[PDB]
Every structure is written in C-alpha cells, then in structure tokens.
Symmetry: D2
C-alpha cells in the first residue's frame, strides 16, 4: 500500500519568514483601505457581493501601502519554500506575485466553489478570525472521477477525505496549488472575517 | 505542510492471502487456455490486437478451471484488505469480482492509456516477468489540471511525480482504484509477459 | 471546425410527458409535507441548512403521496426520452428513480457546488419561480483543465461559455448527466423557491 | 435540448492560409533534416523511440529552413482563425508558436495518450498519409467522470462519442485546445507516416 499523486497544503504562521507584520496594525489597514475605496464599495453593492473585496478595484497594494510591501516580502519566502516542498523545476525564474486583494466577510458571507487560472501557487493570510469555525473548505480534485466509488467512512484519515476543512488562527498563511478547488464557508459569527488572498505566477 | 487526497497503490505478494497458487502451474494454465481458445486467438487476429486476451472470448474462468477459483479466493481477501486501507463505507455489501481475463503480451506489445468503468477496484497479478522493464505506468489523475504548473524536477519524491512506474516480480498482485489511468508499456525482451487482470465492483 | 464531446441539457415543460400535474395543487403539497416533517425541520436547523429539504428525512414520497407517484410517472418518460437523446446503450434495463426530495429556498438561500455520485441522470422540476433570476448555475466539466487557456469573450456562443445560467419557468423540468457540476444561486426575491430534485440510476 | 461546453476541432487544408507550401517539397525537406540530424537519430536510438522526432534535437526550424518559415506564416493565420472560432479574449497579445517538430513514423510506430502543458492551441499538419488508417484518436476530457454512465451505442452521433478518430489527407492541418488528450494510433502500411506537430502559447 503506497501513497501517490499527493496534493500538498502549506499551513504555517506568517512569522516563520520575512519581516515582522503587526497583526493589530493591519486589521485597521484593511479597514482604512475598504472605507476609502469608493469604487470597491460601489462595485460590491452593484454585483451583490456578500462582503467586501478590492480585487476588481485596487491592484498594486504593495506599491501604494508600506505594510503590504512587507507582507509581499514575507509571502515571497513562504511561497519559495513551498515551491521547494513541491519540487518544481523553475530554472532561473522564481515564482512572482501576480494578484493580491483584501476580503472582509460579515455574518452570512460566503465564497462559491472556485479555482485560480494562469497561476501556480494561490494562498490566503488571515487577519481576523472569530467564530472558531472553518475559514476554508477544500475539495478533492479527483471528486468527479469517483462517481462509481463508494463514499468514505465517517471516520477516516485526512489523506482520504474528499473535503478538507481548515481552521486557521490569526497570522496564519495557507498556500495551495492554484488548480485546487476551494470554498470559503459561511461566516457563522457576528463579527467580520478579514483575510488577504493572492496569486503567484511563474513565467 | 500536509499530504492530501492520496491515491493509494496496493502492492503485495499473492501468497499473503488465500490458498497456495503455484507459479509454474499458473503459467502452463494460461498457455493451455490461450492455445485452446481458438475464438480468442481469432478475436486478436481480427482486431489486430498485440498478443492474447481472453477478455472478449471467455467470461467466468474460475467456474471452469480449479486454479482460477483458488486465485479468486485469494484476490477476494486481497481486495477486501485494500478496501479497508481505503476505508470505504461498504454497508452490508462486500466487493465482488465481475471481470477476470488473461493477458499474454509478446516482444513489442503494448496497451493504450485507459481506465475501468463501473468498477471500484481494478488489479493485475503477474505470472511471467522477463527482463528489467516496467509492466505498469500510472498517470496522475490531476495531470490535465496542471497545465500552468511547472514540471517536477527529475529527482523528485515518488508521491509528487506525474507518472509512476512499477516493475513487479512474479507472483505479485497490484491493486488500484478503478478511475486511475494506467498504461502497460512496451515489452522489450523476447519472452512473453503474462499477466491476469481483473475488475471488482460493489454489490 | 467540428463540435465534439458535448454536454447535453434537457429543458422541457413537464406537460410534454406523463399524467397531468396541477401546479397550484403541488405547491401546497410541498408545504403540507414540510410542515408535517418534524424530523426534516429539526435536521435543517441542526445542520444550518439555508431553507428546507426532505432528502435526509423522507425517502419514498411517491409511495406516501399520490401526486408524487404521478410526478415520478411523468419524470420516467422525460428521462427515458433524454436517454435516447444521449444514445445510451442500456440493454434491457431502463433508468429507474433512485432518490427524490423536496426543496424550499427562502431569501438568501443557496446550494453549494456539487455533483451526484452513483447516478446516471439527475434533474429538478420547478414548482414556484418568483424573482426572474437564475435558478441554476452550471459549470464546465473541463474548467480545471483550462488553466493555461485564456478566458472567453464577454459575448460568445453558449456552447463555449464556462458557466451556464438557467432561468426555468414554473412547471419546467431540467435534466442533466449526473457528473455535471451544478450550483443553485442565491434567492434574490423575498418569496420562496420551491423545487423537486431527483436522481436516476441504472443497474 | 441544448448542446453545452463544446470541444472544437479545427480541420482544414493548409492551403486555406499563408503562402504556397508544395507537398512534395515538404516531404523531401523532412527526410533531408532527419538524415542529417545525427543527434536526433541518436536520441531516438538511445530512448528506443518508435521512429524519428526533432523534438529534443532541434529548436527553431523556421529560422533555419525557408519552407518552414512559409509553413509558420500559414499556421499563424490558421491558429488565429481558430482562436476566433473559440472566441478567446486575447487583449493585445496574439498567439505565438513556441514549439514545432517533425515526426517520421514507420510501420508499427505509436505515440502514447498525452497532452501539451503551457500551451493554448496544439496542432499537426500532415505530410505523408499512406494506408486507410487513423492518424489521431481523440479522447473525451470527460472520460474519467463517466464512471457510472452507460456506454454510448455503437451507432451514436459524433458529438457524443468518447473517442474520435481522424483520417486526414496530405496537406491537412488539425488544431485543438492543448488540454485535449490525444493518441497517435499504430501505423499499418509499410510506408512512412510523416507529420509536423506544433504548439502555440499566449504572449
Ligand atoms: Ca533545470
Ligand atoms: Ca511446482
Ligand atoms: Ca518461464
Ligand atoms: Ca529482438
Ligand atoms: Ca446492446
Ligand atoms: Ca512540385
Ligand atoms: Ca511519397
Ligand atoms: Ca508488413
Ligand atoms: Ni480563492
Ligand atoms: Ni487495465
Ligand atoms: Ni443537485
Ligand atoms: Ni501531440
């Protein structure tokens, strides 16, 4: 019995790499951006978006805001070390940050099932975690292939489970390979869920 | 850094379970069947199929020949133990064998990349292994999803490769989940590569 | 330029086949079942289910309730005709109804991205359609494979679009092949969305 | 009853676009290249590869030989027209050619089932077509998902088959989206099956 074709999930505190980022300093940084983003607040109500995003609103956040430059600098090292875990042949060129956005998720807020095209590593760092429930649902890529295969026991190892629920603490970073189907479950607590998500490309 | 959504490959000597199956007795059994099955030879001639199979010409081989009944009994226990490794919820129903066929592959023969529909576990026991070449190439179920992803380094870990190569010895039995794409690569020595393949489904 | 490997979507009014089912008669039938289902109402609050379902509560609805027997009888013919469109080799055995459940979806209610294992044809008939928005999101099965492929134009044919939005009228039935990834979008209207979903198996 | 998520296969005579490419002149070009590329012959000998390829031994063939530059110009227009059939949003960037190689396949040669990573459009023009046998077997991207689904009838429509077989004439050029799994089946006549294959990616 041998383990093959493994999906790897990178879960580590942000303080393992890069510069120091004060957690309380960046909670308010996300709020000050959200409440100055007139076009972002405007787009979210127009689209029926459950919460706030800067994704289709503000692009270069590390250039505009100094703490985000420090965040990226830390994220680069997190990603580079994850690339080494994934044993990617990268030649000379490393993985570079492609997209980076902010998310504020109030009570009842969810993200649908989605992936991230034209990207190698995707990930999310966590600024505010109330509730103590799952901030990430993560689906088996082989799920569609398993149509005749019986369901797993209630009870099995996490290697085998077809849905993986992640409960990250504040200041944690989660990375995954960009093809991974992932979902952000409904915020069950009254207070906000603040996260910063990002994509890393190669060429 | 966690390992998720694992494909599990069972690999064990057939003598671990069931009654004694004499390797020399099994080899002559397959030759005797193949040279009496004139409809099987005829179907391989009419199709232009590389080698011999009993896949389209014979059905329940254990009902007909005593040594295959002794094989099936062993395979039952093999599969049931592999089902417990995979931790399927099987309820009342055990996994039963629906298909079992003989392959006799000569110098230059190949099988295209393929899966096995309406099955839970698929597998192959090996009767004749000449040469130092691979009898199975497994392909990553995630391969098509990895269109933007860089290739793994030549010296990467086994759980991270796109393609896995197995060189079984005589009397081995391999098992996999039926949706796993596999290829039987080209035989290189001038002696026959004999194997018995089989499909298990859920009642 | 040639069109291959097509996913087919069956969209037709329920009155094209089977017995007559009065629309107003069955709106209240679903309500009378939901408000008698003590175990179903109990399970939905316990699970945090956005709305009502009878799926993990009441099984044989055509046996218990006469209008649902008439519904199944009509659905059988809808499915059988769709099997002919799909050109399935079925031998003697037809497609039979495996599971059948009721769904009531109030304002804010959604279903996550999901498929239906151990099934051939899945579908939903629509009892109450306010809003005039989409009651079905339908995702490309090749979506995960298209990671390096650029996004389609705003503007293209529906063959090509990676997400298909369906706006069914009252009394419509939608059928699809069970492996299809599909989502029920958020109910934007104040009034309820009543639907009856079902699975069809083969063997 | 609608047709959704279509795979599109481009098939047209190479003379529809670009400059005049003499078929007899192209055949002798490939033979001249293959019998001078001693490193290419050597790489096929060292790998035990069925036939000849320039895939690992030569890079930019249009920069070196005039007739291939005249080929590339034609292929550019071919692909760009196929991109418009697929209706990609390409922005400022056109699709450029990154890889182009020669295949010379003899009596008995085959290529395994495979895709082309980091590419948008892949294709093959055909230089020599002896016999009445297939030069391409396409496999349904949905094949692994159809594990519970019944097989299509032998007499089913082309858009519904799991496998599609193409028999091009000389001077034809086929295109497909790069994620499409394809197999080049076994050559059956004692003359060479020559083809030029190529990969297009997005700038
Ligand atoms: Ca290298
Ligand atoms: Ca003996
Ligand atoms: Ca021997
Ligand atoms: Ca020899
Ligand atoms: Ca039949
Ligand atoms: Ca001429
Ligand atoms: Ca000739
Ligand atoms: Ca010959
Ligand atoms: Ni995301
Ligand atoms: Ni096989
Ligand atoms: Ni559903
Ligand atoms: Ni190719």
């Amino acid at each position: 019995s041998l383990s093959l074709f493994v999906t790897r999930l990178y879960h580590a505190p942000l303080s393992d790499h890069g510069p120091a980022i004060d957690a309380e300093e960046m909670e308010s940084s996300c709020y000050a951006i959200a409440e100055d983003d007139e076009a972002g607040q405007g787009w979210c109500e127009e689209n029926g978006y459950p919460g706030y995003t800067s994704y289709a609103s503000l692009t270069d956040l590390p250039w505009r805001f100094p703490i985000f430059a420090d965040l990226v600098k830390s994220l680069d090292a997190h990603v580079a070390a994850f690339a080494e875990d994934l044993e990617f042949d990268l030649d000379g060129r490393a993985l570079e940050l492609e997209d980076l956005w902010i998310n504020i998720l109030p009570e009842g807020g969810s993200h649908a099932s989605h992936i991230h095209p034209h990207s190698v590593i995707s990930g999310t760092t966590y600024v505010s975690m109330p509730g103590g429930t799952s901030a990430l649902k993560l689906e088996d890529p082989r799920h569609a292939m398993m149509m005749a295969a019986p369901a797993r026991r209630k009870t099995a190892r996490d290697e085998l489970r077809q849905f993986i629920y992640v409960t990250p603490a504040v200041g944690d970073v989660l990375l995954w390979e960009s093809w991974l189907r992932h979902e952000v479950p409904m915020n069950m607590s009254e207070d906000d869920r603040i996260s910063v998500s990002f994509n890393y490309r190669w060429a």
